[PDB]
Amino acid sequence: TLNGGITDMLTELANFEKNVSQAIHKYNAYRKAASVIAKYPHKIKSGAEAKKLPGVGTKIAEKIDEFLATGKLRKLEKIRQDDTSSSINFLTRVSGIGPSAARKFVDEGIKTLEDLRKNEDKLNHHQRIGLKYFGDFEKRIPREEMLQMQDIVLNEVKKVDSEYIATVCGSFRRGAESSGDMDVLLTHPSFTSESTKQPKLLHQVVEQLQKVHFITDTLSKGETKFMGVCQLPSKNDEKEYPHRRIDIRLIPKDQYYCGVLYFTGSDIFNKNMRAHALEKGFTINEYTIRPLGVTGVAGEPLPVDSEKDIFDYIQWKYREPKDRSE
DNA sequence: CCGACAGCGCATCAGC
DNA sequence: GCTGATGCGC
DNA sequence: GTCGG
Numbered sequence: 001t002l003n004g005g006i007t008d009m010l011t012e013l014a015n016f017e018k019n020v021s022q023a024i025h026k027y028n029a030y031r032k033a034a035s036v037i038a039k040y041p042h043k044i045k046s047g048a049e050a051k052k053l054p055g056v057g058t059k060i061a062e063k064i065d066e067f068l069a070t071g072k073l074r075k076l077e078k079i080r081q082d083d084t085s086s087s088i089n090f091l092t093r094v095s096g097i098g099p100s101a102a103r104k105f106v107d108e109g110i111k112t113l114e115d116l117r118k119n120e121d122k123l124n125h126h127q128r129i130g131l132k133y134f135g136d137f138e139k140r141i142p143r144e145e146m147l148q149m150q151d152i153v154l155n156e157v158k159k160v161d162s163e164y165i166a167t168v169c170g171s172f173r174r175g176a177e178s179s180g181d182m183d184v185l186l187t188h189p190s191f192t193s194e195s196t197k198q199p200k201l202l203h204q205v206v207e208q209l210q211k212v213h214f215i216t217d218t219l220s221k222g223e224t225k226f227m228g229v230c231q232l233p234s235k236n237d238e239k240e241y242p243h244r245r246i247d248i249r250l251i252p253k254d255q256y257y258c259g260v261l262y263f264t265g266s267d268i269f270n271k272n273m274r275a276h277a278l279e280k281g282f283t284i285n286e287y288t289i290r291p292l293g294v295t296g297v298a299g300e301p302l303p304v305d306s307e308k309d310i311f312d313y314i315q316w317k318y319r320e321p322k323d324r325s326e
Numbered sequence: 327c328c329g330a331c332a333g334c335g336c337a338t339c340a341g342c
Numbered sequence: 343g344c345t346g347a348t349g350c351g352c
Numbered sequence: 353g354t355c356g357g
């Protein structure tokens with residue numbers, strides 16, 4: 001919050017380059033800067049001072065000047081004023097609709113929530129459900145509720161097979177007081193890097209979670225990744241709880257640490273860590289951390305028996321989950 | 327300057 | 343059907 | 353849009 005104005009401006013800038021300009025790198029550039037300025041322990045006094053931070057170059061510097069001065073950014077004003085742009089920014093806020101679909105729709109004349117509705121016949125399933133809970137999905141999830149959703153989940157998993165270990169990651173594992181959604185990492189001893197002794201392992205948990213009306217809809221579902229909606233039940237007369245997005249990732253029980261590190265993020269932290277890994281001569285994904293021999297190709301899995309071991313490989317002092325919020 | 331910029335699962339399409 | 347690209351998402 | 357070689 002210390003530099004909220006600047007970061008927000010950088011965030012609006014990043015959402016625009018991504019949603020309208022479809023310039024994925026400019027989107028990321030603005031995000032890094034926003035992230036770097038976010039954790040800066042001083043109330044930035046100038047664009048020249050912000051530049052003293054990696055990720056902030058001349059361009060953002062100028063804009064920070066234009067912002068600190070007037071109290072806003074002209075480039076943005078003209079963007080908030082355009083219609084197609086603001087309209088494309090809005091449709092992307094629907095789950096399943098990215099910059100492409102957005103622009104298309106907006107070309108076809110569809111440009112508002114009302115338009116999306118009278119045109120439901122024009123959305124695939126995912127976009128369909130995305131519109132169904134457009135509102136609900138915009139709301140935060142109080143941690144106290146994350147705690148209740150967890151119990152339903154850990155307890156419905158333990159009911160299918162006591163050998164399943166379900167871990168809530170994302171912002172929750174990072175100690176956040178509120179979360180955007182529930183991210184559940186799942187592991188069963190019947191599925192390792194060596195073999196899938198049991199199929200439907202993920203389908204089993206999804207079914208059981210649907211059997212008890214926790215999972216309400218599916219956005220997409222694979223052999224190892226489920227994407228959907230769930231709802232904490234309410235007590236008598238109680239108004240219903242918002243509908244929430246839930247993702248369940250099944251990872252080989254022997255690659256759990258690379259998986260938990262992955263699913264705890266943050267996304268930018270995962271980006272900076274995975275980016276540093278390269279500079280150090282490693283490549284990190286959600287399964288393992290391998291080397292990058294001469295040719296440049298990835299070697300074989302390096303032994304990992306704890307999250308920290310991964311931080312070690314790349315010469316990085318360990319960082320608590322609560323400190324990976326970038 | 328200039329090329330890298332993290333890494334991958336599911337849906338869906340093109341082309342075969 | 344298959345694979346590779348592309349969209350969208352985590 | 354920024355940065356490292």
Ligand SMILES: Cc1cn([C@H]2C[C@H](O)[C@@H](COP(=O)(O)C(F)(F)P(=O)(O)C(F)(F)P(=O)(O)O)O2)c(=O)[nH]c1=O
Pocket residue numbers: 169170171172178179180181183247262263264265266267270352
């Ligand atoms: C986006 C994304 C996710 N993840 C991994 C690392 C991420 O930590 C993890 C969760 O992904 P989400 O549920 O998409 C998330 F980002 F929203 P969150 O971190 O849970 C969150 F706190 F922002 P909230 O949802 O609002 O509570 O997946 C990545 O590695 N890269 C990505 O681009």
Ligand SMILES: [Cl-]
Pocket residue numbers: 022023024025026027
């Ligand atoms: Cl770009």
Ligand SMILES: [Cl-]
Pocket residue numbers: 254255256257258259287288304305
């Ligand atoms: Cl691992």
Ligand SMILES: [Cl-]
Pocket residue numbers: 285287288
């Ligand atoms: Cl791998």
Ligand SMILES: [Mg+2]
Pocket residue numbers: 170171180181182183
């Ligand atoms: Mg999440």
Ligand SMILES: [Mg+2]
Pocket residue numbers: 170181182183246247352
């Ligand atoms: Mg999620």
Ligand code: NA
Pocket residue numbers: 050051052053054055056057
């Ligand atoms: Na800088």
Ligand code: NA
Pocket residue numbers: 091092093094095096097098
């Ligand atoms: Na979207």
